[PDB]
């Protein structure tokens, strides 16, 4: 039931690490997380996984 | 700083530098950053992109 619950909310982050070379390549895709990270806005991970 | 230009001032040029943070002066547009080859296609009347 927890699997069915976790497959029903689409999380925006899906991992809290975005490397510099990953945003530097694929620059034609206007990714929103790269654009947030290039202007000083970051999301921190929760303490409990 | 909005259009292609053909009347410039007396300033020497420099070779390109890729994949390194530099100061740049493109046609009087100054800044700091890293230059990378692009796959965008520009029309003949276009010079910059935002």
Curated annotation (Swiss-Prot), chain A:
Residues 18-38 are annotated as: Fusion peptide 2. Residues 1-20 are annotated as: Fusion peptide 1. Disulfide bonds join 23-34. It comes from the Viruses. Acts as a viral fusion peptide which is unmasked following S2 cleavage occurring upon virus endocytosis. This is Spike protein S2'. It comes from Severe acute respiratory syndrome coronavirus.
Swiss-Prot record, chain B:
Attaches the virion to the cell membrane by interacting with host receptor, initiating the infection. Binding to human ACE2 and CLEC4M/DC-SIGNR receptors and internalization of the virus into the endosomes of the host cell induces conformational changes in the S glycoprotein. Proteolysis by cathepsin CTSL may unmask the fusion peptide of S2 and activate membrane fusion within endosomes. This is Spike protein S1. It comes from Severe acute respiratory syndrome coronavirus (SARS-CoV). The lineage of its organism: Viruses, Riboviria, Orthornavirae, Pisuviricota, Pisoniviricetes. The chain holds residues 504 to 553 of 1255 of the full protein.
